[PDB]
Structure formats: C-alpha cells, structure tokens
C-alpha cells in the first residue's frame, strides 16, 4: 500500500527527468541543510521488492548504516535521493532498475530489472574530517577532473572566499605556492587541504582553531585569535613541485640556499610552521644522496646539518620537543660534537622532564665549549627541577595512598 502512494504522487528528483527516482516525505526534518558530495551520511532503512517482500533492512539490526554520499558507494537512486533530504527526515523512494541494479540485478536477493522500494531515515550527516582531528571539515560542491593532487611546493591558481562568523573578509583569485600561504594572507589550513584537492574541485572548508590564523588572529581582516573560519576554495589549476629524484644535485644545491634563506626569514618573523616547511625541503632533497663530488658532498652536508639544527630550533619554539630531539639526533648523527645540536637536545629533554638524559647533553656541551656559561646554569637547573619532580611525585603518591585507604576503608557498609 505505501508503494502505490509514491507511484501515484512522487517527486521526480532525477536530473534527466525520466520518473526513475520518485520521493514522498513521510516525516519532515529540522534544519534547511541537505548533505553534499563526500559527506559521511548516517541512515536507517527498510528495503522491499516490487511485490512487497522485505529483502534487506537496517531496522532489523536497529544499528545504522554509515556511507559516503555521492561516492558511488550505493545505487544511483540513493546518491540522488539522500542528497535532497533534511536531518531526521523519513522518505519513501521508488527506484527504477535503471537507477538501481539494472538488468543484472543482485541475485538471489534482487531480480532482473527490479523496481525497488525503500524507507530511508537520515539519522545524521557530517562533512569529511580531512585529518580526523576536526581541524578541517570539507564539504564538496564540485568533483575535480583531477588524476593527481598538488604537493607541498606546487604553484596553484585558486579562487578564495573567506568568512568569519558569516562576515566575508576575503574574496579573490589568488596565485601562490602550497606551503607558503602566509605570503598571500592565506591560513595554513588551505595549503593542507589543497594537497587533498583535485583540479576543478569546488569545496567548502571549515578551518578550526588550529588550521586558521591562530593565537595572533588576522588584524587586517578583523579576525580575532583562534577564530573559526569558513572558506570556499576552487582549485582552478596547479603545477606540481619537482620530486626529490626529479632534481639533479646542481638544482638541489641551488634550491637549498633559496629555501634555507626563505626558512630563516620565516623563523625571524616568528612564523615557525612555515620555517619547518622550508627547511624540511633541504632534508627531503639531500639526506639520502650518494655518489657526489668532493665539493658537492661538503656543500650538501653543510645545508643538511644547518636544516637539522634550524628545525630543532623551530620545534623547540613550536613546543614540539620530541621532533626537536629527533632533529638534534639527526644533526648529531652528521656532527657528533655540534654544540647547538647537543644543547638544543638538552633543552627539549629538560622540557620533556628527562632530567638525567638532559644533564648528559648539557655536560657533553661543556666537553665541547667549556666557556659556555648557559650549559652550567642548565645543569644546576636540571638538578633543581629534578628534585622538585620527585617531591611532587612523592606527594601525589602519598595523597593517592590516602585516597585508596580513606575511601577504600568505607567499602564495608
């Protein structure tokens, strides 16, 4: 009986307009937001054949089915269907075999050229979380024609629209290098999202506090610190960066100086995120190289040790002390006696509360330069801060001994 209702009065939601997909809303939904391409759609459904036989159902599990809409993960009719729905909506869909399983069917469950009936409940729908942290939520307007995505260093031609609490502060066609958005007053989020974008892609991006302009805000755009930004990006075109192996040593050494200088500029400016990117290019290009001239090898090693020591500096200032120790380890690999490498290692280790580990680093610094006043002060700092850590640990333990004895004693009545 509810199958004849949609067959009589049904909304032909097809692009081609051939009565292939007909809808009838059973229960309306709140909000005027409809799901877009690539969104993670949560639904509840019941499937009945042409005669009325219940073939497959989610309600006969009570657990919802989650899939990505407009990604060809479901029948043609469903990708067209669910796209027109509001949240909490219940609608009855009548699907022609042309928009279902065709003449082929899905035997033994679905017959050949079968007109299927569905009851779909749009439970919830979320946009694509690009880095699974909630920092970049993408909603796709248009699919790209792309075969390759731009890479960190690619020059891109894009159209950019930016809103902060509904207010548009940016609306322009801009050309820049992926990784170097700051140069064109573009937040790091765009560069990061562009690497997951295709040529001719049109998408909405919700830039959370971490992928926006951050703690400083963007005073010229009247954007406050850690404000949430919504951008509309269209990747008009791009030209990918040469891969590490696509460049000869001559190019790599020319580019090493440019990106090192560019990295130092970023560093002095306090744009440490962008400094890490520039120096990281030197590491990517020269770390594994072999079969170089005496002059080429000595030069490559100079840039490589500089990049590692500078990256340690960046990571310390970025409060990312593990990466800082990692870089110091690489640098000390190349130059086992490097003062800066040893010192910066002690700095990050003292900060990760690895006092005795850090003590040694500052001690090994004095072994190199004994006239370094700062290593001596940090050795006595390691001593003082390690004594504080044990007293604090002793107190927490003595109080948790109290808790698991004054509360655990009440476990009688």
């Amino acid at each position: 009986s509810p199958t004849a209702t949609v067959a009589e009065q049904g909304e032909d939601i097809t692009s081609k307009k051939d009565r292939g997909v007909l809808k009838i809303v059973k229960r309306v939904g709140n909000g005027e937001e409809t799901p877009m391409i690539g969104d993670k759609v949560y639904v509840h459904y019941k499937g009945k054949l042409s005669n009325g036989k219940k073939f497959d159902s989610s309600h006969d599990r009570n657990e919802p089915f989650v899939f990505s809409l407009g990604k060809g993960q479901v029948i043609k009719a469903w990708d067209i269907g669910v796209a027109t729905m509001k949240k909490g909506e219940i609608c009855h869909l009548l699907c022609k075999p042309e928009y279902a399983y065709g003449s082929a069917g899905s035997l033994p469950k679905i017959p050949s050229n079968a007109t299927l009936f569905f009851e779909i409940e749009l439970l919830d729908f979320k946009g694509e979380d690009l880095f699974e942290d909630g920092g970049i939520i993408r909603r796709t307007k248009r699919k790209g024609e792309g075969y390759s995505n731009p890479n960190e260093g690619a020059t891109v031609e894009i159209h950019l629209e930016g809103r902060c609490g509904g207010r548009m502060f940016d609306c322009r066609d801009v050309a820049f290098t992926v990784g170097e958005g700051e140069d064109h007053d573009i937040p790091i989020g765009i560069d990061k999202a562009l690497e997951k974008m295709q040529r001719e892609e049109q998408c909405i991006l919700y830039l959370g506090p971490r992928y926006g302009f951050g703690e400083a805000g963007k005073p010229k755009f009247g954007i406050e610190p850690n404000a949430e930004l919504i951008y509309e990006v269209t990747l008009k075109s791009f030209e990918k960066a040469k891969e590490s192996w696509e460049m000869d040593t001559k190019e790599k050494l020319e580019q090493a100086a440019i990106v090192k200088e560019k990295g130092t500029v970023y560093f002095k400016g306090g744009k440490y995120m962008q400094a890490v990117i520039q120096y990281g290019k030197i590491v990517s290009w020269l770390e594994m190289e072999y079969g170089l001239s005496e002059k080429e090898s000595k030069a490559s090693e100079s840039f490589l040790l500089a990049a590692f020591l500078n990256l340690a500096m960046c990571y310390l200032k970025l409060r990312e002390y593990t990466k800082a120790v990692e870089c110091c380890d690489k640098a000390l690999g190349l130059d086992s006696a490097n003062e800066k490498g040893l010192y910066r290692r002690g700095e990050a280790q003292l900060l990760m509360n690895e006092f005795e580990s850090a003590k040694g680093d500052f001690e090994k610094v004095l072994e190199v330069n004994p006239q370094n006043k700062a290593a001596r002060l940090q050795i006595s700092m390691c001593q003082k801060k390690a004594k504080e850590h044990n007293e604090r640990d002793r107190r927490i333990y003595a109080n948790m001994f109290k808790k698991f004895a004054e509360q655990d004693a009440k476990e009688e009545a």
Binding site: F267, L305, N310, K340, Y343, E347
Partner: peptide, 9 residues
C-alpha cells in the same frame, strides 16, 4: 650572552 644557542644557521 650565550644567546648563540638561539641563533639559526
């Protein structure tokens, strides 16, 4: 004055 440990290369 041992601010060298803050200087970049």
């Amino acid at each position: 004055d041992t601010s060298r440990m803050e200087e970049v290369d």
